[PDB]
């Protein structure tokens, strides 16, 4: 799946969500590899210059949708702002939508390579795995990824209140329900935006769903390979498994955060429409 | 630090050769390996690759279906398994060790003296 | 598959002069900011022996005489000054692709 996102006025971009965990993954798989021995700490430099070229190539990419892109910003604040006719309005937005949506398709192989570019670094780097006593690998290297990479992340989630940001937004949505429900192309755009609203609330509680179930998984599994040693094949298992639970919590993290925007900056415009309806009686 | 091909000699058309290449001097499991091979009188044609925990395997258009690269890393040897053997196949087989560059590359940096394989009835 | 062309084939040379040998490929061999052209020595009856791979990275126990330049798609090899040790086939190889690809080769020989 492919999410939109607009997390402030006049901006718009758009995540493929797929691409964004494979990409996550190969990067936590090159620096579990690097950090098992000591030997190859040093090698933190490379793998960071590489990771930023696979970044920049993709965004390359991504940017070659950007006149379909704010020939959409342009529709989208007509639609939030209807002042100086609504289906025949809510028409430009599906098309230019479509145009946006269809233009992303037509670069999926351009995408795909820079993704199989990434898959192929980090498996590679996997490969350079070595143990001085193959029965007795050293999980350092687990502990140093973990502590320096992803512990930060799992506190600033512990910190925030997931939970009660979801409720908040349940209870925009039904005060903005109750409020809606007293109309007499304002109400329509009212509709559309609140329409809009619970499409990215559901978004928003899908992957906070992933981050606390993630959260607890890394708290947990981190314990067990951590602290004593693992014969090489359970070690690589080991390494290959916890970087599909930080790929897929990162992944969700950063959905969240750029979906609760998107939410705010929505309602905004869905305040200034109610006020203005309100205004004018 | 050496690479040692055995396993060579006169195939008749048709037939079919394993070349083999010990390592030594070195770790063998911590390097990509290759199998590049030289017609009389002709530079260098890359033919298979394999990476050092076998994940990557590649093959040149023209022995694809008819060679298999395989590694044995307990063993520091390196395996080419030949069939359907043709004239044109006739070369100076090389065993190389490949390196992977940290800026996302792979490189030959040693071969071993090689092994003949002349194809002929 | 990428075509890597050298030029001259053959070159001849006197000891303490420069040798250029020159390397163009069909498609460019750039791979996020590297070019991946190796460039090889080879003596008859002897294996090739790599002189350069970052297309400009000498291999450690490669004399500094030696030096790799280009990108893209035009490559050089520079001997200076040429030894009597240098006479010999000179490869160039792209990693880039797959088929990893070898120039021709330029035959390095002595003015006589």
């Known amino acids: 799946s492919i999410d939109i996102l607009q997390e402030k006025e006049g901006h718009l971009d758009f995540v493929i969500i797929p691409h964004y965990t494979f990409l996550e993954y190969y990067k936590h798989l090159s620096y579990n590899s690097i950090y098992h021995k000591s030997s190859t700490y040093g090698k933190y430099i490379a793998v960071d210059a590489f990771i930023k070229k696979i970044n920049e190539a993709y965004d390359k990419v991504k940017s070659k949708c950007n006149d379909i892109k704010n020939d959409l910003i342009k529709t989208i604040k007509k639609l939030e702002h209807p002042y100086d006719a609504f289906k025949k309005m809510f028409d430009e937005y599906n098309t230019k939508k479509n145009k946006f949506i269809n233009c992303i398709k037509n670069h999926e192989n351009d995408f795909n390579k820079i993704c199989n570019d990434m898959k192929n670094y980090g498996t590679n780097l996997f490969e350079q795995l070595s143990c001085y006593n193959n029965n007795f690998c050293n999980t350092n290297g687990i502990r140093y990824h973990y502590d320096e990479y992803i512990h930060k992340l799992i506190l600033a989630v512990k910190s925030k209140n997931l939970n009660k940001d979801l409720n908040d937004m349940k209870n925009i949505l039904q005060q903005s329900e109750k409020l809606l429900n007293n109309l007499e192309i304002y109400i329509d755009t009212i509709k559309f935006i609140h329409k809009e609203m619970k499409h990215i609330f559901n978004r928003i509680e899908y992957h906070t769903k992933i981050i606390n179930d993630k959260t607890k998984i890394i708290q947990d599994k981190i314990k067990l390979n951590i602290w004593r040693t693992f014969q090489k094949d359970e070690l690589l298992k080991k390494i290959l498994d916890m970087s599909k639970e930080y790929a897929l919590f990162i992944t969700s993290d950063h959905l969240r955060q750029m979906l609760y925007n998107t939410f705010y900056s929505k309602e905004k415009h869905l305040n200034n429409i109610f006020h203005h309806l309100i205004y004018v009686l | 630090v050496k690479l040692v091909e055995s396993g060579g000699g006169v195939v008749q058309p048709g037939g079919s050769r394993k070349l083999s290449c010990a390592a030594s001097g070195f770790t063998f499991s911590d390097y990509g390996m290759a199998w590049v091979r030289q017609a009389p009188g002709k530079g260098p044609e890359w033919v298979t690759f394999?990476?050092?925990?076998?994940?990557?395997?590649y093959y040149a258009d023209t022995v694809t279906g008819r060679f298999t690269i395989s590694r044995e890393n307990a063993k520091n040897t390196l395996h080419l398994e030949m069939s359907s053997l043709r004239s044109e196949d006739t070369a100076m087989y090389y065993c190389?060790?490949?390196?992977?560059?940290?800026?996302?590359?792979?490189?030959?940096?040693?071969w071993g003296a090689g092994t003949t394989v002349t194809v002929s009835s | 598959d990428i075509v890597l062309t050298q030029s001259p084939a053959s070159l001849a040379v006197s000891l303490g002069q420069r040798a250029t040998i020159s390397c163009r490929a069909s498609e460019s061999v750039e791979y996020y900011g590297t070019s991946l052209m190796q460039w090889f020595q080879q003596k008859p009856g002897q294996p090739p022996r790599l002189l350069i791979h970052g297309a400009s990275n000498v291999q450690s126990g490669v004399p500094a005489r030696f030096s790799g330049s280009g990108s893209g798609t035009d490559f050089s090899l520079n001997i200076h000054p040429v030894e009597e040790d240098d006479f010999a086939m000179y490869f160039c190889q792209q990693s880039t692709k797959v088929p990893w690809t070898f120039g021709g080769g330029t035959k390095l020989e002595i003015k006589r």
């Open positions: 394999i990476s050092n925990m076998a994940y990557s395997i």
């Open positions: 190389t060790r490949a390196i992977f560059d940290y800026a996302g590359y792979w490189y030959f940096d040693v």
